[PDB]
């Protein structure tokens, strides 16, 4: 029934299947220029100690394109993202979305308004092209810096973005204008952290921020930073220390519907 | 509070949510109206569902509804038109939508797959699936079909939007499915999914939600009525919504009790 | 003795406790055309005599078509067994006929020219019988106005039938419904399902059994009075019926409304 | 089971103890004399005052009393029929009153294949249809007619002719032969059951002529028979609606039937 979630547990101070996934850019695949590296990695994982039949692969055309409703495909996910001086925000937001869980609702921006009433209520935008425009409203439902009867004088927050997390002043109403033909926006609540996917950044210094709070932008015990020159060295290093990554992660947060975010109407 | 661990439950013997509906486009063409959704919403308001809480989504065919048929709705009722040749389609669609499925994607040209127990099947979907299987021996030698032969395989499914394939467990097999129009994932059945109820118009209660020959349980969530006009069916559904909602309960995974137990 | 008052009945378990019938059959005319004989009724009477029931009191009636039998059935008998031909295109006809002949309906007339109507129970169903019935209905909310159809007109109604010989209809409880039907040929009655009727049993002479007897989609049980057998020749069906006449008599019983003691309970 | 026919109940003496439709039947003569298109809704509104909710009042027309006597239909838990006296149709009124007032359980009969006779001093013959001309010929012990011939059916004693409803009383202990019209009439042997309190008769005009029983000596006038004077049908309707309480008290809805006909048919 309720699994005894309200019944206190008690221990003592006297008592003394699995799957693996890898996510890589197609640039590495072109650099390797081989059609059997999958076999090599599979056999190396088999020899290291992880039984064969539990290692798969997946590729994306670009970092932003992979963010179009990202999915999960294993009970263990190790994702590698290339570093750049321009795609910092996309990497950070994608890591924030795929590092935790979410509970979203469908939203309509032509028949009602919306508001956020906590520090964990955010709006998630995903699609091939999102153009979000938001106009704040006061108590008497008037226009402040933008006209309700018009739709060309709002405040810009997105421009041809494939993934953007928007936050407004929590506790006030808004009117949203967006081309819903190709992109949708969902009101979500961050229930808690997810312990099934670990993000490893290759390139420069650690820059991934998972908290919109300025005062606290911490680094978790799962985001890794390794320098790289050739992708084969990175693959060998990851295979070499697989047990540590397995231990720091967990297998008790598998999603049954294989979706990075839950979508309840 | 506490999750992840089951604890003994003890007790004493002595002492308004969303609902989605689905329908064929043929019904809408046979009704010839556009405010009908609003009328049924008002009738639900009279029956005890607050206005602004009942949704309606429209598909064109059972095959179209079969690709990515994920129902995300606290209480789901599905109307299915009974055909004369789509018995497999209806049966496997009901089986997929009635059981909680945990799936692992499979690369089709890198590994050789098998099955663990009798509660394991292969769920496949796509525009067109042409699945071929060749059971190898224990010594990597083909039996009636060669590993590098693409013509002698035993055909099992062709041009099917939704196909559930089961093979004999205990020995490996080779798979060759076109991963441009189809995708096959290793799925394991956990238990009954009680958030979906299906009302079948026409037919004779043939949908078998289990491939086992010996057993053929008729789960109560497969209702059967006969139709001539769609307004009659909609009126019957709306009038007796209480019985349908009493048949179903809260989803076993939406509540914060299956969290960290393959949640949702 | 006292009638019309439900009283406790005394009983016991240590006391050691453990014909004159009138049979009737209804069959379609295609059986009579196929058998190519007209003296078969004498053979059936003799066979019934062999089993033990007296002759002379057994009556037989024919109906031209299942639609002809559908309109205004006549049932004045003691053990009704009806043979209904099965089809894969006319399921609703068999369902409605068996439902009507299986349960007692206390009905009142309906005047849809000077009144409105609404339901108050789960046994409230609307039965239309006639030669050309086309029920046209427009729901009215609590404010007595049309939703999805204008009360002023009648062609814009959402129909539930079209020239049906018989149609059983149910409407959403708690709301009014304005009706417009051509009363010159068809009649609509408001009936309530009081209880089961054991005086009539239906044998589905055909294939896939599809009968439902309940208006709610949640439950579609298979009652014992509903018999079903395969068929290629009607003489085989008659032989099977006469051989198992004892089982049919045991599963059925005398009508629960004409026991000569259940008076003032809506019958006798 | 047997519905409490073995255990009598007990009460007390010194202790202190101190959807329901109604049908209306009226001839078409009133429908032509009133000259009102929407009179039915007004009558329903008037009946609303006396506690009847809307949806329980009906209005049915019949062309002629004798024609209406063919296949009577009971449509409510309370039936009141407005019948107009005629100076030369007393027997038809008496037959209709007898047929509607008391319950009837009839047995099937076919004179062309069998002979029939009354079993007691309380069972008669009832025939209904468009035209019913019935002739009776007694037969002696050796099956020979007295006053009529077995071979010829024209010399029989005529008892019915040019009638819509025929209620014939016959002697007991002797067989009979009937040359009935087996096409435009239906004849059933019936046994009288008892007093039914589901109907009442309101007579406009006449001088209280209703013999509800075949007994010549006892011609009772039960409390459910009422007479009022008429010159305009609106006055009659107002009188009926002005005393619905009394006619409700004189009736009871626990005598309602199931079948459309006012008489059961157990074959």
């Amino acid at each position: 029934q309720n699994y005894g979630i309200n019944l206190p547990i008690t221990g003592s101070m006297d008592i003394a299947t699995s799957t693996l996934c890898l996510y890589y850019p197609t640039e590495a695949a072109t650099e390797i220029n081989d059609n059997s590296w999958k076999d090599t990695l599979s056999q190396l994982f088999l020899t290291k100690g992880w039984p064969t039949g539990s290692v798969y692969f997946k590729e994306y055309t670009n970092i932003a394109s992979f963010s179009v409703d990202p999915q999960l495909y294993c009970d263990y996910n190790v994702v590698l993202m290339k570093y750049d001086a321009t795609l910092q925000l996309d990497m950070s937001e994608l890591a924030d979305l795929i590092l935790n869980e979410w509970l979203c609702n469908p939203m309509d921006i032509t028949l009602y308004y919306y508001q956020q009433t906590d520090e964990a209520n955010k709006w998630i935008s995903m699609g091939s092209s999102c153009t979000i425009k938001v106009c704040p409203l006061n108590t008497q439902t008037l226009g402040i810096g933008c006209l309700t009867t018009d739709a060309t004088t709002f405040e810009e927050v997105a421009t041809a973005e494939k993934l953007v997390i928007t936050d407004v002043v929590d506790g006030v109403n808004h009117k949203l204008d967006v081309t819903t033909a190709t992109c949708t926006i969902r009101n979500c609540k961050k229930l808690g952290p997810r312990e099934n996917v670990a993000v490893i950044q290759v390139g420069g210094s650690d820059i991934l921020d998972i908290t919109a709070d300025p005062t606290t932008a911490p680094q978790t015990e799962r985001m890794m930073r390794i320098n790289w020159k050739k992708w084969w060295q990175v693959f060998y290093t990851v295979v070499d220390y697989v047990d540590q990554i397995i231990q720091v992660m967990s297998k008790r947060s598998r999603s049954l519907n294989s979706a990075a975010f839950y979508y309840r109407v | 509070q506490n999750y992840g661990i089951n604890l003994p439950i003890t007790g004493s013997m002595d002492i308004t949510s969303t609902l989605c509906l689905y329908y064929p486009t043929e019904a809408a063409t046979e009704i010839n109206d556009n405010s009908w959704k609003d009328t049924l919403s008002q009738l639900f308001l009279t029956k005890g569902w607050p206005t602004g809480s009942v949704y309606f989504k429209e598909y064109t065919n059972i095959a179209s509804f079969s690709v990515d048929p994920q129902l995300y709705c606290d209480y789901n009722v599905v109307l299915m038109k009974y055909d004369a040749t789509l018995q497999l389609d209806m049966s496997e669609l009901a089986d997929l939508i009635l059981n909680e499925w945990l799936c692992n994607p499979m690369d089709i040209t890198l590994y050789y797959y098998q099955q663990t127990d009798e509660a394991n099947k292969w769920i496949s979907m796509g525009s067109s699936c042409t699945i071929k299987v060749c059971p190898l021996n224990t010594q990597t030698l083909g039996i009636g079909c060669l590993t590098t032969d693409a013509t002698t395989f035993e055909e099992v499914a062709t041009a099917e939007k939704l196909v559930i394939t089961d093979v004999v467990d205990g020995v490996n097999h080779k798979l060759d499915v076109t991963t441009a129009t189809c995708t096959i994932r290793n799925c394991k059945k956990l238990g009954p999914r009680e958030n979906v109820a299906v009302i079948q118009v026409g037919g004779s209660d043939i949908l078998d939600i289990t491939a086992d020959p010996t057993t053929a349980p008729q789960t109560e969530r497969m209702m059967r009525i006969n139709w001539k006009k769609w307004w009659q069916v909609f009126y019957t559904v709306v009038d007796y919504v209480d019985q349908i909602i009493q048949v179903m309960s809260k989803r076993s995974r939406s509540l914060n009790s299956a969290a960290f137990y393959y949640r949702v | 003795q006292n009638y019309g008052i439900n009283l406790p009945i005394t009983g016991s378990m240590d006391i050691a406790y453990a014909l004159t019938s009138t049979l009737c059959l209804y069959y379609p005319t295609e059986a009579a055309t196929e058998i190519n004989d007209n003296s078969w009724k004498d053979t059936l009477s003799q066979l019934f005599l062999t089993k033990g029931w007296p002759t002379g009191s057994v009556y037989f009636k024919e109906y031209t078509n299942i639609a002809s039998f559908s309109v205004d059935p006549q049932l004045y008998c003691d053990y009704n067994v009806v043979l209904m031909k099965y089809d894969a295109t006319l399921q609703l006809d068999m369902s409605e006929l068996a439902d009507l002949i299986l349960n007692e309906w206390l009905c009142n007339p309906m005047d849809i020219t000077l009144y409105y109507y609404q339901q108050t129970d789960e046994a409230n169903k609307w039965i239309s019988m006639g030669s050309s019935c086309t029920i046209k209905v427009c729901p009215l909310n609590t404010q007595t106005l049309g939703i999805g159809c204008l009360t002023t007109d009648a062609t814009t109604f959402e129909e539930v039938a079209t020239a049906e010989k018989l149609v059983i209809t149910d409407v959403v409880d708690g709301v009014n419904h304005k009706l417009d039907v051509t009363t010159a040929t068809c009649t609509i009655r408001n009936c309530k399902k009081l209880g089961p009727r054991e005086n009539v049993a239906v044998i589905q002479v055909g294939g896939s059994d599809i009968l439902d007897i309940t208006a709610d989609p949640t439950t579609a049980p298979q009652t014992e009075r509903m018999m079903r057998i395969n068929w290629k020749k009607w003489w085989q069906v008659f032989y099977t019926v006469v051989d198992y006449v004892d089982q049919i008599i045991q599963v059925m019983s005398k009508r629960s409304r004409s026991l000569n003691s259940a008076a003032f309970y809506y019958r006798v | 089971q047997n519905y409490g026919i073995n255990l009598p109940i007990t009460g007390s003496m010194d202790i202190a103890y101190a959807t329901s439709t109604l049908c209306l039947y009226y001839p078409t003569e009133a429908a032509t004399e009133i000259n009102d298109n929407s009179w039915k809704d007004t009558l329903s509104q008037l009946f609303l005052t006396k506690g009847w909710p809307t949806g329980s009042v009906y209005f049915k027309e019949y062309t002629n009393i004798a024609s209406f006597s063919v296949d009577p239909q009971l449509y409510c838990d309370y039936n009141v029929v407005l019948m107009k006296y005629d100076a030369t149709l007393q027997l038809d009124m008496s037959e209709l009153a007898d047929l509607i007032l008391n319950e009837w359980l009839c047995n099937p009969m076919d004179i062309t294949l069998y002979y029939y006779q009354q079993t007691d001093e309380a069972n008669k013959w009832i025939s209904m249809g468009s035209s019913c001309t019935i002739k009776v010929c007694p037969l002696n012990t050796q099956t020979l007619g007295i006053g009529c011939l077995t071979t010829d059916a024209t010399t029989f004693e005529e008892v019915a002719t040019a009638e819509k409803l025929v209620i014939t009383d016959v002697v007991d202990g002797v067989n009979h032969k009937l040359d009935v019209t087996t096409a435009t009439c239906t004849i059933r042997n019936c046994k009288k059951l008892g007093p039914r309190e589901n109907v009442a008769v309101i007579q406009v005009g006449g001088s209280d002529i209703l013999d509800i029983t075949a007994d010549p000596t006892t011609a009772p006038q039960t409390e459910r028979m009422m007479r009022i004077n008429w010159k305009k049908w609106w006055q009659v309707f107002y009188t009926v609606v002005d005393y619905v309480d009394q006619i409700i008290q004189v009736m009871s809805k626990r005598s309602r039937s199931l079948n459309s006909a006012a008489f059961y048919y157990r074959v």
Binding site: - | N32, D33, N34, S35 | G148, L150 | -
Partner: protein, 48 residues
């Protein structure tokens, strides 16, 4: 000092009149019914 809640609960019917006060001053709006459903397709006649 419990009388505040009891008087709030008891003498709370006259507030109904307040509705009228807002209803009298305000301006309402009624609209005719829109023709629903699909529309029949009908073009011209063949031309020469």
């Amino acid at each position: 000092a419990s009388l505040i809640y009891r008087q709030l609960l008891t003498n709370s019917y006259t507030v109904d009149l307040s509705d009228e006060i807002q209803e009298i001053g305000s301006t309402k709006s009624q609209n005719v019914t829109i023709n629903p459903g699909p529309f029949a397709q009908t073009g011209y006649a063949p031309v020469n």
